[PDB]
Amino acid sequence: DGEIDIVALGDALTRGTGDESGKGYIGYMVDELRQQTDEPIRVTNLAIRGLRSDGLLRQLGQSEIQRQIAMADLIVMTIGGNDLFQGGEALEWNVKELDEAKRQYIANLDRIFALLRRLNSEAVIFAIGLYNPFSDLDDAKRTSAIVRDWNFASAEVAAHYPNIVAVPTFDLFALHVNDYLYSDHFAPNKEGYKRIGERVASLITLT
């Protein structure tokens, strides 16, 4: 009260890994909010770099995390990237394993959204979607197709709940992807994180 509380959840993208400056996408969000109001803005960042949808669901079971979700005026989250690019450098391109991982991700995401809504009735949830960091490599056709497929399924889940907005990221990284990527060619850089943060910021209108 007399404060705007942003709870940030999820994986390395929300923790701002890859940005030269400490600023992730969240810092660009906050900058835009501070242009709209003089009310103090508090960020509570709960993100863990290696987090997957199963880990996020377990984390939201903890009563301290739960008290903070409940106070949120706005929730922003990024999850699924680690469910999809688990390891081996997308070694598990076995259709069977890919389907298992997706059905597991979708089942978890449904329970994450349902849980967040039982804890916080009103707060808008921005669920940031996936991009293709490998769009410039040999198997770009297939990686892009899988990412668009995951994103479509995430948005269907989001569509089951009030005030959950699936924020697309795919087209921000579509042209000249390396210009927006860290030295690891996976997570974003300064510019990548600016693009994402400005995009999410555009969707927030306080009044």
TrEMBL record:
All copies of the SGNH hydrolase-type esterase domain together span: 8-195
Transmembrane ranges?
Answer: none
MF terms in GO: hydrolase activity, acting on ester bonds; phosphatidylcholine lysophospholipase activity
User: What's the domain of life for this entry?
Assistant: Bacteria
Q: What is this protein called?
A: GDSL-family esterase
